[PDB]
RNA sequence: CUUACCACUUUGUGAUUCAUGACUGGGGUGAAGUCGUAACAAGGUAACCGUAGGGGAACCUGCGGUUGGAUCACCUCC
């Protein structure tokens, strides 16, 4: 009810977190510490081998990971996290 | 002798019913004829129902309806 309205808090694309994953998909993972709030980070990201990476492979459930916010969709209510960025730039 | 009632019988106009009739509508059956291929597979434009218009023929097209229809819907929110 409350949290989505004042989502300025971590709005800036540059902002980064450490959140904890809930479950995996095969297109992402979802990393949800913010509580009542949850990102995704798509399988495109998480690696520098594009999709040559199953989410299960790089990360597993109940596992904390550093991530930047990239895109918040105020309405439609969906945040786009990035995991390949908060670690190396080879 | 006469009046009344009344059978035979006569006339007029209807109803119903059987037969027959130039010509004409469709229906059934038929190894091997002609024209095509409408349906059954997504039957090669999914089919079908009501209705309307059109076309040698099966049919075609419009409007609404039905599933008694294959394959079924798009990058990332559980
Ligand atoms: Mg015939
Ligand atoms: Mg046919
Ligand atoms: Mg028919
Ligand atoms: Mg077809
Ligand atoms: Mg057909
Ligand atoms: Mg055809
Ligand atoms: Mg007709
Ligand atoms: Mg026509
Ligand atoms: Mg129709
Ligand atoms: Mg109805």
Curated annotation (Swiss-Prot):
It is found in: Cytoplasm. Residues 14-84 form the S1 motif domain. Induction: Represses its own translation via the N-terminus (at protein level). The modification N6-acetyllysine is found at residue 16. Phosphorylated; probably on a serine. (Microbial infection) ADP-ribosylated and RNAylated (about 30% of the modifications) by phage T4 ADP-ribosyltransferase ModB. This results in covalent RNA-S1 conjugates and allows the phage to reprogram the host's gene-expression system. Disruption phenotype: Essential, it cannot be deleted. Upon depletion cell growth and total protein synthesis become linear. Coiled coil: none annotated. Required for translation of most natural mRNAs except for leaderless mRNA. Binds mRNA upstream of the Shine-Dalgarno (SD) sequence and helps it bind to the 30S ribosomal subunit; acts as an RNA chaperone to unfold structured mRNA on the ribosome but is not essential for mRNAs with strong SDs and little 5'-UTR structure, thus it may help fine-tune which mRNAs that are translated. Unwinds dsRNA by binding to transiently formed ssRNA regions; binds about 10 nucleotides. Has a preference for polypyrimidine tracts. Negatively autoregulates its own translation. It is not clear if it plays a role in trans-translation (a process which rescues stalled ribosomes). Evidence for its role; binds to tmRNA with very high affinity, is required for binding of tmRNA to 30S subunit. Thought to play a role only in translation of the tmRNA in vitro. Evidence against its role; overexpression of whole protein or various S1 fragments inhibits translation, they have no effect on trans-translation, and an in vitro system with S1-less ribosomes performs trans-translation. Belongs to the bacterial ribosomal protein bS1 family. The 6 S1 motif domains are not equivalent; the first 2 no longer bind rRNA but instead are involved in protein-ribosome and protein-protein interactions. Binds to the 30S ribosomal subunit via its N-terminal fragment (190 residues, the first 2 S1 motifs) and allows translation by S1-free ribosomes. The same fragment represses its own translation. The first 3 S1 motifs do however bind to mRNA pseudoknots in the 5'-UTR of at least 1 mRNA (rpsO); deletion of S1 motifs 1-3 but not motifs 4-6 is not viable, although a deletion of motifs 4-6 grows slowly and is cold-sensitive. Part of the 30S ribosomal subunit; the largest protein subunit, it is loosely associated and not always found in ribosomal crystal structures. Does not bind rRNA. Probably requires ribosomal protein uS2 to associate with the 30S subunit. Binds in the junction of the head, platform and main body of the 30S subunit; the N-terminus penetrates the 30S subunit while the C-terminus faces ribosomal protein uS2. Nascent polypeptide chains cross-link this protein in situ. Can be cross-linked to mRNA in the ribosome. (Microbial infection) During infection by bacteriophage Qbeta, part of the viral RNA-dependent RNA polymerase complex, the other subunits are the viral replicase catalytic subunit (AC P14647), host EF-Tu and EF-Ts. This is Small ribosomal subunit protein bS1. The lineage of its organism: Bacteria, Pseudomonadati, Pseudomonadota, Gammaproteobacteria, Enterobacterales. The chain holds residues 264 to 353 of 557 of the full protein.
